[PDB]
Design a protein around this nucleic acid. Structure first.
Ligand SMILES: [K+]
Ligand SMILES: [Mg+2]
Ligand SMILES: [Mg+2]
Ligand SMILES: [Mg+2]
Ligand SMILES: [Mg+2]
Ligand SMILES: [Mg+2]
Ligand SMILES: [Mg+2]
Ligand SMILES: [Mg+2]
Ligand SMILES: [Mg+2]
Ligand SMILES: [Mg+2]
Ligand SMILES: [Mg+2]
Ligand SMILES: [Mg+2]
Ligand SMILES: [Mg+2]
Ligand SMILES: [Mg+2]
Ligand SMILES: [Mg+2]
Ligand SMILES: [Mg+2]
Ligand SMILES: [Mg+2]
Ligand SMILES: [Mg+2]
Ligand SMILES: [Mg+2]
Ligand SMILES: [Mg+2]
Ligand SMILES: [Mg+2]
Ligand SMILES: [Mg+2]
Ligand SMILES: [Mg+2]
Ligand SMILES: [Mg+2]
Ligand SMILES: [Mg+2]
Ligand SMILES: [Mg+2]
Ligand SMILES: [Mg+2]
Ligand SMILES: [Mg+2]
Ligand SMILES: [Mg+2]
Ligand SMILES: [Mg+2]
Ligand SMILES: [Mg+2]
Ligand SMILES: [Mg+2]
Ligand SMILES: [Mg+2]
Ligand SMILES: [Mg+2]
Ligand SMILES: [Mg+2]
Ligand SMILES: [Mg+2]
Ligand SMILES: [Mg+2]
Ligand SMILES: [Mg+2]
Ligand SMILES: [Mg+2]
Ligand SMILES: [Mg+2]
Ligand SMILES: [Mg+2]
Ligand SMILES: [Mg+2]
Ligand SMILES: [Mg+2]
Ligand SMILES: [Mg+2]
Ligand SMILES: [Mg+2]
Ligand SMILES: [Mg+2]
Ligand SMILES: [Mg+2]
Ligand SMILES: [Mg+2]
Ligand SMILES: [Mg+2]
Ligand SMILES: [Mg+2]
Ligand SMILES: [Mg+2]
Ligand SMILES: [Mg+2]
Ligand SMILES: [Mg+2]
Ligand SMILES: [Mg+2]
Ligand SMILES: [Mg+2]
Ligand SMILES: [Mg+2]
Ligand SMILES: [Mg+2]
Ligand SMILES: [Mg+2]
Ligand SMILES: [Mg+2]
Ligand SMILES: [Mg+2]
Ligand SMILES: [Mg+2]
Ligand SMILES: [Mg+2]
Ligand SMILES: [Mg+2]
Ligand SMILES: [Mg+2]
Ligand SMILES: [Mg+2]
Ligand SMILES: [Mg+2]
Ligand SMILES: [Mg+2]
Ligand SMILES: [Mg+2]
Ligand SMILES: [Mg+2]
Ligand SMILES: [Mg+2]
Ligand SMILES: [Mg+2]
Ligand SMILES: [Mg+2]
Ligand SMILES: [Mg+2]
Ligand SMILES: [Mg+2]
Ligand SMILES: [Mg+2]
Ligand SMILES: [Mg+2]
Ligand SMILES: [Mg+2]
Ligand SMILES: [Mg+2]
Ligand SMILES: [Mg+2]
Ligand SMILES: [Mg+2]
Ligand SMILES: [Mg+2]
Ligand SMILES: [Mg+2]
Ligand SMILES: [Mg+2]
Ligand SMILES: [Mg+2]
Ligand SMILES: [Mg+2]
Ligand SMILES: [Mg+2]
Ligand SMILES: [Mg+2]
Ligand SMILES: [Mg+2]
Ligand SMILES: [Mg+2]
Ligand SMILES: [Mg+2]
Ligand SMILES: [Mg+2]
Ligand SMILES: [Mg+2]
Ligand SMILES: [Mg+2]
Ligand SMILES: [Mg+2]
Ligand SMILES: [Mg+2]
Ligand SMILES: [Mg+2]
Ligand SMILES: [Mg+2]
Ligand SMILES: [Mg+2]
Ligand SMILES: [Mg+2]
Ligand SMILES: [Mg+2]
Ligand SMILES: [Mg+2]
Ligand SMILES: [Mg+2]
Ligand SMILES: [Mg+2]
Ligand SMILES: [Mg+2]
Ligand SMILES: [Mg+2]
Ligand SMILES: [Mg+2]
Ligand SMILES: [Mg+2]
Ligand SMILES: [Mg+2]
Ligand SMILES: [Mg+2]
Ligand SMILES: [Mg+2]
Ligand SMILES: [Mg+2]
Ligand SMILES: [Mg+2]
Ligand SMILES: [Mg+2]
Ligand SMILES: [Mg+2]
Ligand SMILES: [Mg+2]
Ligand SMILES: [Mg+2]
Ligand SMILES: [Mg+2]
Ligand SMILES: [Mg+2]
Ligand SMILES: [Mg+2]
Ligand SMILES: [Mg+2]
Ligand SMILES: [Mg+2]
Ligand SMILES: [Mg+2]
Ligand SMILES: [Mg+2]
Ligand SMILES: [Mg+2]
Ligand SMILES: [Mg+2]
Ligand SMILES: [Mg+2]
Ligand SMILES: [Mg+2]
Ligand SMILES: [Mg+2]
Ligand SMILES: [Mg+2]
Ligand SMILES: [Mg+2]
Ligand SMILES: [Mg+2]
Ligand SMILES: [Mg+2]
Ligand SMILES: [Mg+2]
Ligand SMILES: [Mg+2]
Ligand SMILES: [Mg+2]
Ligand SMILES: [Mg+2]
Ligand SMILES: [Mg+2]
Ligand SMILES: [Mg+2]
Ligand SMILES: [Mg+2]
Ligand SMILES: [Mg+2]
Ligand SMILES: [Mg+2]
Ligand SMILES: [Mg+2]
Ligand SMILES: [Mg+2]
Ligand SMILES: [Mg+2]
Ligand SMILES: [Mg+2]
Ligand SMILES: [Mg+2]
Ligand SMILES: [Mg+2]
Ligand SMILES: [Mg+2]
Ligand SMILES: [Mg+2]
Ligand SMILES: [Mg+2]
Ligand SMILES: [Mg+2]
Ligand SMILES: [Mg+2]
Ligand SMILES: [Mg+2]
Ligand SMILES: [Mg+2]
Ligand SMILES: [Mg+2]
Ligand SMILES: [Mg+2]
Ligand SMILES: [Mg+2]
Ligand SMILES: [Mg+2]
Ligand SMILES: [Mg+2]
Ligand SMILES: [Mg+2]
Ligand SMILES: [Mg+2]
Ligand SMILES: [Mg+2]
Ligand SMILES: [Mg+2]
Ligand SMILES: [Mg+2]
Ligand SMILES: [Mg+2]
Ligand SMILES: [Mg+2]
Ligand SMILES: [Mg+2]
Ligand SMILES: [Mg+2]
Ligand SMILES: [Mg+2]
Ligand SMILES: [Mg+2]
Ligand SMILES: [Mg+2]
Ligand SMILES: [Mg+2]
Ligand SMILES: [Mg+2]
Ligand SMILES: [Mg+2]
Ligand SMILES: [Mg+2]
Ligand SMILES: [Mg+2]
Ligand SMILES: [Mg+2]
Ligand SMILES: [Mg+2]
Ligand SMILES: [Mg+2]
Ligand SMILES: [Mg+2]
Ligand SMILES: [Mg+2]
Ligand SMILES: [Mg+2]
Ligand SMILES: [Mg+2]
Ligand SMILES: [Mg+2]
Ligand SMILES: [Mg+2]
Ligand SMILES: [Mg+2]
Ligand SMILES: [Mg+2]
Ligand SMILES: [Mg+2]
Ligand SMILES: [Mg+2]
Ligand SMILES: [Mg+2]
Ligand SMILES: [Mg+2]
Ligand SMILES: [Mg+2]
Ligand SMILES: [Mg+2]
Ligand SMILES: [Mg+2]
Ligand SMILES: [Mg+2]
Ligand SMILES: [Mg+2]
Ligand SMILES: [Mg+2]
Ligand SMILES: [Mg+2]
Ligand SMILES: [Mg+2]
Ligand SMILES: [Mg+2]
Ligand SMILES: [Mg+2]
Ligand SMILES: [Mg+2]
Ligand SMILES: [Mg+2]
Ligand SMILES: [Mg+2]
Ligand SMILES: [Mg+2]
Ligand SMILES: [Mg+2]
Ligand SMILES: [Mg+2]
Ligand SMILES: [Mg+2]
Ligand SMILES: [Mg+2]
Ligand SMILES: [Zn+2]
Lengths: 122, 59, 118, 16, 204, 131
RNA sequence: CGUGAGGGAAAGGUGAAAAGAACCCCGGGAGGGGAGUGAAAUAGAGCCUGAAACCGUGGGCUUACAAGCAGUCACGGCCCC
RNA sequence: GAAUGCCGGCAUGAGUAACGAUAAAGAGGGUGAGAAUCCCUCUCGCCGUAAGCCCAAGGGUUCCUACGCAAUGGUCGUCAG
RNA sequence: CGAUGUCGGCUCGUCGCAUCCUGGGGCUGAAGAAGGUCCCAAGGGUUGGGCUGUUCGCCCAUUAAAGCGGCACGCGAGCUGGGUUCAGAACGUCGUGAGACAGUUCGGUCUCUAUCCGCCACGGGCGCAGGAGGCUUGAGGGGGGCUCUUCCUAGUACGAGAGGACCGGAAGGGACGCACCUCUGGUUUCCCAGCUGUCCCUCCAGGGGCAUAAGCUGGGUAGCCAUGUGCGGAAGGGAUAACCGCUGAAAGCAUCUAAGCGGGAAGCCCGCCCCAAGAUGAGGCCUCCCACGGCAGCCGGUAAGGACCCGGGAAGACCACCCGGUGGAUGGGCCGGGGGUGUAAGCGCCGCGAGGCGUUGAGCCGACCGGUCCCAAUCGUCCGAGGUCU
């Protein structure tokens, strides 16, 4: 449950540390994004000399949410933060790594590259 | 609010037509099988102190 | 809405409703019969019946439980010694409520007696 | 949408 | 156009192909037909259905006459299924098979005098910034001198629920003839122990 | 009619009795069936059970672990056919039925706060001696 | 009423005569019903006359598919003389 | 017949809003024509840098006791400034 | 002018169509895709944020689109009170001055009670020619009506290439609506536990009050809920709009038309869900009651039946509605299960002690699913047809 104003940790080596969502890309007026949704966000904080800097307007896919997400098998899964991975307009990651686990929902939604890059898929 | 207030005095006819539902209904009473006195059903007879065919309470 | 909720509020806040049930039970386990309003009467049935049942068990735990509501060591003793035993074979229903025929003058409240069963 | 602002014609009412 | 009377019993979820399916259990059979309506006699086609046994003491005389003409034991409720003619004298769950797609009518939960926010999902008033004893009020209900009245139909507070609601196109997950049990996928109007009607869906 | 009974009846065909009992505070390994591309596999989840909601057949339990620097919680229905087995890896001792509070503790504090429930350990070893 | 200067009301009538109703009855009392006084008691003291607004009981006519400055003109029904 | 006229009487709104701190009550016993409301007992709750106690102002018999309940008391009253 | 409250916002909408999108078209300087332009169409839809009192506008990010207007520039007896009409104070400017300025600045009292119409809900009455208990028909109303992406067809038709379809067929979404509580997530005023200060019971142990109208803290059933779940928009049938025809005169040709017949919209009528015979035009079916007495009428007692009274209820402001009233499981108690809490008191052992271990998943235990006549629904009373005329 990510919406405009929501901060996210970035889970990659692009150089951003925190991005703040300003728009969820899922139709004309989707209220929330979840795992596997592409958001548009501003970069609020970054490390020196990254591929990205504070102030940019970038796109990212949400990989972990703190509101638990439900699955067809009757289970659920939930992470301790809300994080995302920055992308280009081809749904490909922009960094060369991703940190921490990511949700298996990403695979189903076609963010294949990210899933293999992830240390664990839960 | 702006202090609503009646626009016209109510006609005798219309005040009394509002009261068309104000009549009391007579109390509902049954004889007591012991002392034959009229009493509310499901209550202890306040005349002779009987309810359910036994003396319950000192009248 | 109030769907499937159990137990009246009796226009008393939480701790006052509580003292009410206690003081009623105190009065009831003392005189064996009292008069109250009908709603008050119906609510007392359960509250006392539970205490009486605990006297029937007789153990130490039971006494200390009961003593939380009733508070009076003498009265508890009476409940345990005199009251309880005359219910050893009675399985629930240790009290009865019967409705009185005349309302109160000052407020028209329907009255009823509540008493301990023979 | 009337382009010229229209004056109030009654004061904000006071206890007077 | 087949139908049956039943009772709502409660919800759970079962497992079917590594999937959890929310379901509602309804006790449907058996329902004896106790009158049939024909175009000659009544103008249309239906089957009057009966459901749940009744203490014959509690069934008055005009009603006793009605059952006896059917060859039928006294029953708690009568309801019709329209445009329906089962060949038997009794209808059971056997008329629906898993996979079939049904409609169910129930009597909705009653919320009594409901406010405008619960009933019609109005937005209420703001909760600070000066909002003044209007936090759950409806706001304007009109215009001014034109039209100078309130439309019929205008959404306002009033009773809500305790009314006939039909939910349509539910998947039949299972049927257990040995218990007169019907497992429909999804949520059914009304409280547990409530009366319902289950028909073949009017959806394609 | 007995409405509760009817429910449990419908439910009964899915009820499992084969899984081990466990308490909140215990550390557990849940072998869960998972699908990906294109196959299905067994993926283990190992953590502390921090909560056990009870509703008969609808009882569900919640397990928490730290994976590569991030806290993860998993919720499982206890009679899910998708669970292969659950292995008790350690008995722990809570004084509390729901353990939400460990979400804010360090790995050190948790170890102090949830000591090994030595009683249920001997108890687990008392069995595990077959005939 | 106003600190004060000062402001500033309402409120008349039993009967010729109290002969102002002993006494009994219901009622805690109030009040009443009888008895009694009187030419008269809807002259009974909450008292000459006792208008109108206003409230009530009883009786005739009338009214629950009807659109109204409330009346008027016509006709018919019912009730009274 | 009108002067938002004057004095008085009586309506309408209406059996409606309200009955003045959300510190809180319950039972038993007594008294009496009548009792949730007076007295008595027991239980519960509230104030305690007061919601206790003593002075000054101001009020002027409100003090104590007996006998009362038309009115005053926001209900009731057998109680009472 | 013995008062018609005034900008903007919020709230709630409803209407117009000169249509922003979605549907149907003609022309194109229409290859395809995508546009331009006019015609038809008001069914539905038409986002979030920065600035400013703003409406407007500009900008950011999206979108199928981010339409324009009317309703006292809709809506202050519905809210706001930032704008602007009072009294204070200051700046620039004008005036000798008092003061003033479509010049600016800071501050500045927005009225518990709805009589009538109207609206949303709910009853009482009478009627619907015999009186009744059920089950219904649907005149007529209301609700609803949105739309995107990707894939296959097919990298095909088209095009030098870049690009890229009609038609048809699958899958997944957004917002909205109705219902629901199995899961997920809330609340859960006393269902459990821990904790402090103080007063108390009864000294220890064990408890009780108060610290809020829960003292605080960790939890939490049923219910009521959304953030959670199911489902809906249609399909289809008919009639049309613009537009395209077939056959075809007047008018030897031509013409969609003058006679006749086709195709054709998210729109219209039906279909779907809800209300509905006060539909006084008061409908229909099934079943029960009976032609009782005294004087289209009155009176008395009854019939079928109903009400009163009572125990209640996911029904509910009262009312109504539904269930039950000893021939009974309606509530309360009690027993069992679930469920919460998470190992009671007491005793034994270990430690100087705070404590720790065992007995013990113990003790306690609202509402949930059930059982059981232990307690209470005693006993009863009153209404209630004798059927108008051709
Ligand atoms: K001015
Ligand atoms: Mg910067
Ligand atoms: Mg106002
Ligand atoms: Mg008002
Ligand atoms: Mg106000
Ligand atoms: Mg007012
Ligand atoms: Mg007025
Ligand atoms: Mg009058
Ligand atoms: Mg009158
Ligand atoms: Mg009126
Ligand atoms: Mg309700
Ligand atoms: Mg409430
Ligand atoms: Mg109940
Ligand atoms: Mg309680
Ligand atoms: Mg209740
Ligand atoms: Mg009250
Ligand atoms: Mg009280
Ligand atoms: Mg409370
Ligand atoms: Mg308290
Ligand atoms: Mg208290
Ligand atoms: Mg009784
Ligand atoms: Mg009194
Ligand atoms: Mg009574
Ligand atoms: Mg139904
Ligand atoms: Mg509201
Ligand atoms: Mg709603
Ligand atoms: Mg809502
Ligand atoms: Mg809002
Ligand atoms: Mg606001
Ligand atoms: Mg709000
Ligand atoms: Mg204010
Ligand atoms: Mg105010
Ligand atoms: Mg407020
Ligand atoms: Mg206005
Ligand atoms: Mg207005
Ligand atoms: Mg008009
Ligand atoms: Mg209702
Ligand atoms: Mg199956
Ligand atoms: Mg239910
Ligand atoms: Mg259940
Ligand atoms: Mg069974
Ligand atoms: Mg793995
Ligand atoms: Mg003066
Ligand atoms: Mg003076
Ligand atoms: Mg003067
Ligand atoms: Mg004078
Ligand atoms: Mg004289
Ligand atoms: Mg004289
Ligand atoms: Mg006398
Ligand atoms: Mg006397
Ligand atoms: Mg006298
Ligand atoms: Mg008298
Ligand atoms: Mg006299
Ligand atoms: Mg004489
Ligand atoms: Mg003479
Ligand atoms: Mg006279
Ligand atoms: Mg005279
Ligand atoms: Mg006089
Ligand atoms: Mg004279
Ligand atoms: Mg006179
Ligand atoms: Mg007079
Ligand atoms: Mg007169
Ligand atoms: Mg009269
Ligand atoms: Mg008509
Ligand atoms: Mg008529
Ligand atoms: Mg006219
Ligand atoms: Mg004429
Ligand atoms: Mg005449
Ligand atoms: Mg004149
Ligand atoms: Mg005046
Ligand atoms: Mg006047
Ligand atoms: Mg006037
Ligand atoms: Mg005057
Ligand atoms: Mg005059
Ligand atoms: Mg005057
Ligand atoms: Mg006057
Ligand atoms: Mg009056
Ligand atoms: Mg009233
Ligand atoms: Mg009123
Ligand atoms: Mg009121
Ligand atoms: Mg007052
Ligand atoms: Mg009131
Ligand atoms: Mg008071
Ligand atoms: Mg008070
Ligand atoms: Mg308070
Ligand atoms: Mg007393
Ligand atoms: Mg007494
Ligand atoms: Mg009293
Ligand atoms: Mg009295
Ligand atoms: Mg006293
Ligand atoms: Mg002190
Ligand atoms: Mg002095
Ligand atoms: Mg004085
Ligand atoms: Mg004096
Ligand atoms: Mg003295
Ligand atoms: Mg004195
Ligand atoms: Mg004194
Ligand atoms: Mg005295
Ligand atoms: Mg007095
Ligand atoms: Mg008196
Ligand atoms: Mg006196
Ligand atoms: Mg007084
Ligand atoms: Mg008084
Ligand atoms: Mg007073
Ligand atoms: Mg008095
Ligand atoms: Mg006295
Ligand atoms: Mg006094
Ligand atoms: Mg004016
Ligand atoms: Mg005026
Ligand atoms: Mg005027
Ligand atoms: Mg005025
Ligand atoms: Mg005015
Ligand atoms: Mg047009
Ligand atoms: Mg188009
Ligand atoms: Mg094209
Ligand atoms: Mg081209
Ligand atoms: Mg075009
Ligand atoms: Mg055209
Ligand atoms: Mg439209
Ligand atoms: Mg419209
Ligand atoms: Mg529009
Ligand atoms: Mg802002
Ligand atoms: Mg803004
Ligand atoms: Mg703006
Ligand atoms: Mg601002
Ligand atoms: Mg501007
Ligand atoms: Mg476009
Ligand atoms: Mg915009
Ligand atoms: Mg508009
Ligand atoms: Mg306008
Ligand atoms: Mg305006
Ligand atoms: Mg306005
Ligand atoms: Mg205002
Ligand atoms: Mg305004
Ligand atoms: Mg106004
Ligand atoms: Mg107005
Ligand atoms: Mg409002
Ligand atoms: Mg202002
Ligand atoms: Mg400005
Ligand atoms: Mg100003
Ligand atoms: Mg000023
Ligand atoms: Mg200045
Ligand atoms: Mg200057
Ligand atoms: Mg100058
Ligand atoms: Mg100068
Ligand atoms: Mg000037
Ligand atoms: Mg100037
Ligand atoms: Mg000016
Ligand atoms: Mg200037
Ligand atoms: Mg300035
Ligand atoms: Mg300002
Ligand atoms: Mg200020
Ligand atoms: Mg205000
Ligand atoms: Mg009022
Ligand atoms: Mg009114
Ligand atoms: Mg009017
Ligand atoms: Mg009616
Ligand atoms: Mg009625
Ligand atoms: Mg027909
Ligand atoms: Mg109509
Ligand atoms: Mg229709
Ligand atoms: Mg329609
Ligand atoms: Mg291709
Ligand atoms: Mg779809
Ligand atoms: Mg549940
Ligand atoms: Mg839940
Ligand atoms: Mg759950
Ligand atoms: Mg939960
Ligand atoms: Mg407790
Ligand atoms: Mg407590
Ligand atoms: Mg303590
Ligand atoms: Mg101690
Ligand atoms: Mg204390
Ligand atoms: Mg205290
Ligand atoms: Mg307190
Ligand atoms: Mg919680
Ligand atoms: Mg809590
Ligand atoms: Mg719960
Ligand atoms: Mg939701
Ligand atoms: Mg169609
Ligand atoms: Mg057609
Ligand atoms: Mg041609
Ligand atoms: Mg031709
Ligand atoms: Mg020619
Ligand atoms: Mg033609
Ligand atoms: Mg055609
Ligand atoms: Mg045509
Ligand atoms: Mg064609
Ligand atoms: Mg459509
Ligand atoms: Mg219907
Ligand atoms: Mg009818
Ligand atoms: Mg009907
Ligand atoms: Mg008509
Ligand atoms: Mg009929
Ligand atoms: Mg009730
Ligand atoms: Mg009944
Ligand atoms: Mg009976
Ligand atoms: Mg019986
Ligand atoms: Mg029972
Ligand atoms: Mg029970
Ligand atoms: Mg259990
Ligand atoms: Mg358990
Ligand atoms: Mg232990
Ligand atoms: Mg122990
Ligand atoms: Mg020792
Ligand atoms: Mg249990
Ligand atoms: Mg219990
Ligand atoms: Mg039995
Ligand atoms: Mg009797
Ligand atoms: Zn008697």
């Amino acid at each position: 449950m990510i919406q405009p104003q929501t901060y996210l940790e970035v889970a990659d080596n692009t150089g951003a540390r925190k991005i703040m969502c300003i728009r969820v890309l899922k139709g004309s007026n989707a209220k929330y994004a979840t795992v596997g949704d592409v958001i548009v966000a501003s970069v609020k904080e970054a490390i020196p000399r990254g591929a990205v800097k504070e102030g940019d307007v970038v796109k990212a896919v949400v990989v972990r949410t703190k509101k638990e997400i439900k699955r067809p098998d009757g289970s659920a899964i939930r992470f301790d933060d809300n994080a995302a991975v920055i992308i280009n307009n081809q749904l490909e990651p922009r960094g060369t790594r991703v940190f921490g686990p990511v949700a298996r929902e990403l695979r189903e939604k076609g963010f294949m590259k990210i899933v293999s890059l992830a240390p664990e898929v839960l | 609010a702006k202090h609503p207030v009646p626009k016209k005095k109510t006609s005798k006819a219309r005040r009394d037509a509002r009261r068309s539902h104000h009549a009391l209904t007579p109390p509902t009473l049954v004889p007591c099988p012991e002392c034959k006195a009229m009493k509310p059903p499901h209550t202890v007879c306040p005349e002779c102190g009987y309810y359910a065919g036994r003396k319950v309470l000192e009248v | 809405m109030r769907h499937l909720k159990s137990g009246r509020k009796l226009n008393r806040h939480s701790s006052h409703r509580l003292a009410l049930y206690r003081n009623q039970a105190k009065s009831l386990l003392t005189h064996g019969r009292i008069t109250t309003t009908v709603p008050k009467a119906k609510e007392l049935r359960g509250f006392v019946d539970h205490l009486i049942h605990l006297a029937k068990r007789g153990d130490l735990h039971a006494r200390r439980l009961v003593l939380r509501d009733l508070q009076d060591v003498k009265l508890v003793r009476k409940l345990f010694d005199e009251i309880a035993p005359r219910y050893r074979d009675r399985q629930g229903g240790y009290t009865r409520v019967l409705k009185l025929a005349e309302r109160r003058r000052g407020d028209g409240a329907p009255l009823a007696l509540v008493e301990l069963v023979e | 949408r009337r382009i010229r602002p229209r004056p109030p014609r009654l004061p904000r009412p006071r206890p007077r | 156009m087949k139908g049956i009377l039943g009772v709502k019993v409660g919800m759970t979820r079962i497992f079917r192909d590594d999937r959890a399916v929310p379901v509602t259990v309804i006790l449907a059979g058996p329902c004896p037909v106790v009158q049939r309506r024909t175009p000659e006699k009544d103008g249309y086609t239906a089957v009057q259905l009966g459901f749940l046994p009744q203490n014959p003491k509690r069934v008055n005389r005009p009603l006793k006459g009605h059952f006896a003409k059917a060859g039928v034991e006294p029953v708690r409720i009568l309801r019709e299924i329209r445009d329906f003619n089962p060949e038997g004298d009794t209808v059971t769950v056997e008329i629906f098979k898993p996979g079939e797609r049904v409609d169910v009518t129930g009597t909705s939960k009653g919320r009594g005098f409901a406010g405008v926010m619960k009933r019609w999902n109005f937005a209420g008033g703001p909760d600070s910034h000066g909002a003044h004893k209007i936090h759950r009020h409806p706001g304007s209900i009109g215009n001014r001198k034109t039209p100078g009245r309130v439309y019929k139909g205008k959404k306002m507070a009033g009773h809500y629920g305790a009314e006939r609601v039909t939910v349509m196109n539910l998947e039949v997950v299972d049927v257990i003839p040995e218990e007169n049990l019907l497992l429909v996928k999804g949520a059914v109007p009304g409280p547990n122990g409530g009366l319902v009607i289950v028909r073949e869906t009017k959806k394609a | 009619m007995n409405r509760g009974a009817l429910i449990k009846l419908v439910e009964s065909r899915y009820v499992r009795t084969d899984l081990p009992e466990f308490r909140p505070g215990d550390t557990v390994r849940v072998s869960y069936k998972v699908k990906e591309g294109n196959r299905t596999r067994i993926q283990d989840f190992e953590g502390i059970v921090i909560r056990i909601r009870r509703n008969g057949f609808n009882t569900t339990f919640t397990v928490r672990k730290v994976s590569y620097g991030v806290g993860v919680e998993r919720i499982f229905p206890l009679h899910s056919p998708l669970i292969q087995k659950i292995d008790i890896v350690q008995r722990g001792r809570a004084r509390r039925a729901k353990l939400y509070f460990i979400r804010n503790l360090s790995d050190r504090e948790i170890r102090r706060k949830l000591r090994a429930d030595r009683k249920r350990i001997d108890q687990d070893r008392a069995a595990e001696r077959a005939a």
